[PDB]
Every structure is written in C-alpha cells, then in structure tokens.
C-alpha cells in the first residue's frame, strides 16, 4: 500500500509532491523513504568521506521546502548531542548502521544529561526526530566499516546547538556542506 520509489530519483520526485503543501504527513514521508531500497550505484557520487569526521553532502534543495543530503560516517565517526532548530528531521540508513541515542533537554541547572532512548537503525530504516521528541547523538556502530545515511530537513536550517553531556551547556554551531550535488565545497 506504500508507494515504493524504485530509484533515488523517484524518491526525490515523490518528496517534491509531499512537501509542495503546507501540511506534511510524517508517517507517510517516513514510510516512503524507508521503502526506497538503498542502491549504492545511485548515490555513490555523493559518498565523499573525510578521515577525521563525518561529512554532509547536499543532494537536493527541495525548492526551498526541504534539504535532502547524504551523510558519510567514517570508521568510528559520531556526532555531538544536538537539536534540530525546530525542523522536521528524517534519517534513513543507506549503508552500515547508526546508533541513535535520544537525550532529554537540559534545565537551566547544570547537570549530567539523561538518556531517554537508545537504538540501532537497521538496513534501509527511516527514523524521525524534532525538538519536541528530544535531542540526539548519532554514531557509526562500526570501527571497521563506514555508515551512510540519507537525511531530510524541513524547513532547511544551517545552524543548530551542540550540548556538553557533562553539564547540559550548549553552543551554537554553524553547519557546513562537504559537497553539493557531487561537487566538493571550498574548504572541507
Ligand atoms: Fe541529528
């Protein structure tokens, strides 16, 4: 019953329809993204890794409605604890596996941060998060294999906050692209 995109190209086309409006059905988007069968032949042009940290690779600008990007996690690479600047955020596995740890939001008080949930995203699985759901950290589970994920943010955003697990203090972080449309960006 779920519309199954047969290619990354089909999926992008479907996403343009699902975000053409002002409403967006989260479970519907989640199911269609999950239904797409990851095919490395179709997204290898975006799979540009860096030795020391993960990379963000823009695939499609979604007519200003959303950003679609591919994130490449080297061996052992992970993110900090961050928020998502009041946007919808979908992340689907394209290769390997990521461990998502959901964190609760900190008070004004300084305290160790509390884990709310911990899981591994399976092959082709699509997960969903926004700021009302919680904060999270994402990491490659493997020290011998990469992980690759497909992320969709609506509306688009280029700033977020990173959180110190020990205190809950946060810092604003401007997010950058490693590449856009298969083309490396100036200055990593
Ligand atoms: Fe995230």
Three-state SS for 118-131 is EEECCCCCEEEECC
Query: Which is nearest to 19 in space by CA: 36, 6, 32, 7?
Result: 32
Residue 102 Cα to ligand 1 middle (Å): 10
For residue 120 the two structure tokens come to 């591994």
Per DSSP, the residues of 75-98 read TT-B--EE--TT-EEEEEEEES-E
- CA dist 97 and 109 (Å) reads 34
Residue 161 Cα to ligand 1 middle (Å): 10
Residue 81 Cα to ligand 1 middle (Å): 8
Domains for the chain: give ranges and CATH numbers: 1-188 (2.60.120.10)
For residue 83 the two structure tokens come to 């928020």
Residue 69: its H or E element = strand 67-73
Q: What is the resolution of this structure in A?
A: 2.3
For 158: left if phi > 0, alpha if psi spans -120 to 50, otherwise beta; the answer is alpha
Residue 25 Cα to ligand 1 middle (Å): 20
Binding residues: 82, 84, 136
Method: X-ray
For residue 97 the two structure tokens come to 């596996």
């Amino acid at each position: 019953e779920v519309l199954k995109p047969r290619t990354l190209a089909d999926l992008i086309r479907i996403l343009h329809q699902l975000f053409a409006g002002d409403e967006v059905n989260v479970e519907e988007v989640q199911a269609i993204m999950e239904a797409y069968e990851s095919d490395p032949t179709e997204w290898a042009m975006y799979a540009k890794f860096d030795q020391y940290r993960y990379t963000r690779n823009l695939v499609d600008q979604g007519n200003g409605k959303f950003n679609l990007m591919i994130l490449c996690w080297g061996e052992g690479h992970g993110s900090s604890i961050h928020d998502h600047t009041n946007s919808h955020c979908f992340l689907k596995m394209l290769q390997g596996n990521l461990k998502e740890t959901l964190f609760a939001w900190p008070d004004k008080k300084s305290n160790e941060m509390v884990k709310k949930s911990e899981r591994v995203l399976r092959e082709n699985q699509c997960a969903y998060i926004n700021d009302s759901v919680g904060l999270h950290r994402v990491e490659n589970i493997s020290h011998t294999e990469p992980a690759v994920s497909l992320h969709l943010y609506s509306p688009p955003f280029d700033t977020c906050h990173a959180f110190d697990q020990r205190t809950g203090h946060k810092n604003k972080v401007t997010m950058t692209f490693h590449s856009k449309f298969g083309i490396r960006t100036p200055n990593a």
